[PDB]
Amino acid sequence: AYVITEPCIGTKCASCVEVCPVDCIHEGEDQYYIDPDVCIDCGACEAVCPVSAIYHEDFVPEEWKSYIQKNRDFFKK
Numbered sequence: 001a002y003v004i005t006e007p008c009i010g011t012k013c014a015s016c017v018e019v020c021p022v023d024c025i026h027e028g029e030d031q032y033y034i035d036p037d038v039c040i041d042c043g044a045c046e047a048v049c050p051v052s053a054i055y056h057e058d059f060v061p062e063e064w065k066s067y068i069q070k071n072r073d074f075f076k077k
Ligand code: SF4
Pocket: 004, 007, 008, 009, 010, 012, 013, 014, 015, 016, 017, 031, 032, 048, 049, 050, 051, 054
């Protein structure tokens, strides 16, 4: 499962939408948030993101693992 981080935050980007097999990218407001728990781990959204920042949750540095929790949380409750 891959998740967004910091470099994605470019005021309502929307490239990662529609292409995802199960469209598990969501607006909080600022960006499109991937649900790691719905993401079936696939080489689309990251390749589409013109920054290369949608990394595996474990790959995302601890500082930014906060986002993995947020991305989890958003849709869990
Ligand atoms: S394409 Fe990248 S920058 Fe844009 S919303 Fe998605 S993850 Fe963030």
